[PDB]
A paper describes a structure:
Glycogen synthase kinase 3 beta ([name]-3β) is a serine-threonine kinase known for its ability to regulate glycogen synthesis and to play a critical role in many intracellular pathways, such as the signaling pathways involving insulin, growth factors, and neurothrophins (Wnt pathway and insulin pathway the most known). In contrast with most kinases, [name]-3β is constitutively active, being inhibited in response to a specific stimulus, and it can only act on a pre-phosphorylated substrate. The central role of [name]-3β in many intracellular pathways makes this enzyme an exciting and puzzling target for drug discovery. This widespread activity has also led to identifying [name]-3β dysregulation as responsible for the development of many diseases, such as Alzheimer’s disease (AD), bipolar disorder, diabetes, cardiovascular diseases, and cancer.
The conserved water molecule next to Thr138 is observed close to the putative fluoro-phenyl site. The fluorine atom of the fluoro-phenyl portion of G5 is involved in a direct hydrogen bond with Arg141. In [name]-3β, water molecules next to Leu132 are involved in a hydrogen bonding network with the methyl sulphonyl group of G5 and Lys85, Asp200. Indeed, from displacement assays, G12 is an ATP-competitive inhibitor not substrate competitive, while G5 is an ATP-competitive inhibitor of [name]-3β with a mixed inhibition for the substrate.
Numbering used by the authors: 36 to 385
């Protein structure tokens, strides 16, 4: 069995190409539609096809975003094509994406079942690359709005992390309100829990912080099946938000008091041997006030990631770390002066 379609490439000019794929497996499916795996007939490479029902009145926001994006820490849209087949007057948008075997979710859980934590070196590598991808998309004013371990793809050999699933992603314009029900359970910023509709891209930074803390703890940091339950687990760590903090998160005062608990020292949250810099980084990501959180780029420049800027740094398997320093002007526009930290001396050699 061999499907052949005429697809438009994700990047580059509109040059339609005959794409032929086989071994059409299935994997996940939910809020969008089905997701298949396949093998491309020529190159032999594996790819993931995300099929979704196409709306006639508007064009697909995921597609529109995916096409603008080109970055080595973000899944590549290789092609896209429209199809249907059988019952209904339904048009399906198919997104052909690079297949990436593992996810931070699966990896984290392997370590968690075996009562281990992921070696800090991998925490650094994975977290740094996430923050790069955030710095990039945020530079276009695009918020992902669903940062969680399941959406962080990993190549285990190269230690390369790629952000994926832009189904929730959106251009956040100041003054324009946005839906407050977007982020997944454990990774929602307090302002989202409080139902704020004037949130900024800092929600991604909170989410990322929840991933960091989770990789350090070996389990979700702010669990709970309700918002109430989540906010309690948060307050247990951060302490009770001041009236100031509360108005910063959500001006539309949903309106009620919380149990006055003081901040359980961040040091006592983690294992004894946990690097003090990792803890420091957490506390600067997981802040009540959206504007007080680090930017993605400021996070990349955090001391916690110093080891990665060492010229001698290698992966435990002996291979080189992936390219961490080739920042574009786009990536740096947030705050160009930071390049003095981000790009280390040995990366400037001619
Ligand atoms: C709908 S989705 O593409 O966002 N979702 C992520 C996941 C995925 N995406 C790509 N591009 N490549 C691989 C995978 C994936 C990885 C591990 C696994 F067990 C299942 C799917 C499927
Ligand atoms: Cl042509």
């Amino acid at each position: 069995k061999v499907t052949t379609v005429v697809a438009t490439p994700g990047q580059g000019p509109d040059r339609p190409q005959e794409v032929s794929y086989t071994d059409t497996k299935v994997i996940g499916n939910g809020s969008f539609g089905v997701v298949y795996q396949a093998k491309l007939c020529d190159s032999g490479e594996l790819v993931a096809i995300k099929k979704v029902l196409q709306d006639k009145r508007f064009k697909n926001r995921e597609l529109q975003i995916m096409r603008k994006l080109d970055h080595c820490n973000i899944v590549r849209l290789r092609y896209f094509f429209y199809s249907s087949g059988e019952k209904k007057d339904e048009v399906y948008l198919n997104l052909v994406l690079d297949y990436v075997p593992e996810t931070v979710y699966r990896v984290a859980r392997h370590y968690s079942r075996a009562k281990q934590t992921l070696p800090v070196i991998y925490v650094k590598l994975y977290m740094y690359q996430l923050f790069r991808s955030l710095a990039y998309i945020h530079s276009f004013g695009i918020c992902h709005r669903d940062i969680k371990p399941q959406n962080l793809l990993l190549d285990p050999d190269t230690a390369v992390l790629k952000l994926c699933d832009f189904g929730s992603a959106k251009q956040l314009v100041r003054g324009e309100p946005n839906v407050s029900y977007i982020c997944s359970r454990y990774y929602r910023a307090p302002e989202l829990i409080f139902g704020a509709t004037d949130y900024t891209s800092s929600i991604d930074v909170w989410s990322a912080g929840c991933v960091l803390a989770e990789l350090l703890l070996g389990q979700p940091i702010f669990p709970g099946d309700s918002g109430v339950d989540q906010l309690v687990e948060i307050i247990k760590v951060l302490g009770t938000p001041t009236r100031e903090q509360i108005r910063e998160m959500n001006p539309n005062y949903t309106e009620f008091k919380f149990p006055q608990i003081k901040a359980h020292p961040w040091t006592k949250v983690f294992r004894p041997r946990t690097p003090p810099e990792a803890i420091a980084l957490c506390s600067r990501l997981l802040e009540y006030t959206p504007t007080a959180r680090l930017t993605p780029l400021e996070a990349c420049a955090h001391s916690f990631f110093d080891e990665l800027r060492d010229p001698n740094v290698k992966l435990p398997n002996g291979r080189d770390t992936p390219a961490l320093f080739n920042f574009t002007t786009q990536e740096l526009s947030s705050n160009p002066p930071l390049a003095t930290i981000l790009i280390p001396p040995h990366a400037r050699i001619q």
